[PDB]
Curated annotation (Swiss-Prot):
Listed GO biological process terms: proteasomal protein catabolic process; protein unfolding
Residues that coordinate or bind ATP: 49-54, 180
Protein name per Swiss-Prot or TrEMBL: Proteasome-activating nucleotidase
Keyword Protein transport: no
Record comment regarding domains: Consists of three main regions, an N-terminal coiled-coil domain that may assist in substrate recognition, an interdomain involved in PAN hexamerization, and a C-terminal ATPase domain of the AAA type.
Annotated GO CC locations: cytoplasm; proteasome-activating nucleotidase complex
Residues of the full protein shown: 136 to 392 of 399
UniProt gene name: pan
Keyword Membrane: no
GO molecular-function terms, A-Z: ATP binding; ATP hydrolysis activity
Length: 249
């Protein structure tokens, strides 16, 4: 279960997403009053593990909506017409369960400029065309490779708003570290230091660092968590050791 309080370092990105969906949904009345149709799709982009799915999930909680997630790669099918059918069913289901947030991760797998997948693409855009705003089912897509995308994905009525979800900067990381260490008791711990030593980390790495910290404490049998635990969790999660593994698997 996810809420805005489970998210760190993305204050303006959240506001933007909220302004694009939460705001209209609540007071749609008041948008037509100004001549602006509420967006149908929002595209989130940036490197992996930095909060894109989190924002979409938490947004879904806050508007009390069904949250349906599909990974783009799985809409690529060996057999003809299947990719398109799935997208069709996806949208039917999302109506069945309205209101809903559809979250299509790795939308690049389908929205790249073999030709079957373009069929699959046409279907989705077809689906957005025809949904009609004001507006009960909303789509959120995510990619780490945005520059790839067919611009027909981005025309108005389709993935209008773009929001970059970056690697966390120094303060972001601090915020994120707090989110995932809020429910531990630490004593020796300076998190500014941890934030300083993790340049380039993602939100996920940082969660992993807090997680590896607490278990390090456990394996050395204490009940609290200390700076040393974090210094080695930082060294475990980041750094060659897990690096080579990745090059290895
Ligand atoms: N901005 C963030 N704030 C708090 N936790 C985060 C953040 N970004 C990533 N995480 C942690 O990493 C995990 C993956 O985040 P997710 O939103 O799935 O990343 P992606 O951008 O790959 O969709 C989440 O479960 C979350 O706990």
């Amino acid at each position: 279960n996810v809420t805005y309080n489970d998210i760190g370092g993305l204050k303006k990105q959240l506001q933007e997403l909220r302004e694009a969906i939460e705001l209209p949904l609540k007071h749609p009345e008041l948008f037509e009053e100004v001549g602006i149709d509420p967006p149908k799709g929002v595209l989130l982009y940036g490197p992996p593990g930095c909060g894109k799915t989190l924002m979409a999930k938490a947004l879904a909680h806050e508007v009390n909506a069904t949250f349906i997630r599909v990974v783009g790669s799985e809409l690529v099918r060996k057999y003809i017409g299947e990719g398109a059918r799935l997208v069709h069913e996806l949208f039917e289901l999302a109506k069945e369960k309205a209101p809903t947030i559809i979250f299509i991760d790795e939308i690049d797998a389908i929205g790249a400029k073999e030709r079957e997948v373009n069929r699959t693409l046409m279907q989705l855009l077809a689906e957005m065309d025809g949904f009609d705003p004001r507006g009960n089912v909303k789509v959120i897509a995510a990619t780490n490779r945005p520059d790839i995308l067919d611009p027909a994905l981005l025309r108005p009525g389709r993935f209008d708003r773009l929001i970059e979800v970056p690697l966390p900067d120094f303060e972001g990381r601090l915020e994120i570290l707090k989110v995932h260490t809020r429910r531990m008791k630490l004593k020796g711990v300076d998190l500014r230091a941890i934030a300083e030593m993790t340049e380039g980390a993602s939100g996920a790495d940082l969660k992993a660092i807090a997680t590896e910290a607490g278990m390090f404490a456990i394996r050395e049998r204490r009940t609290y968590v200390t700076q040393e635990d974090f210094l080695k969790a930082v060294d475990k999660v980041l750094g060659n050791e897990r690096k080579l593994l990745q090059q290895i698997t």
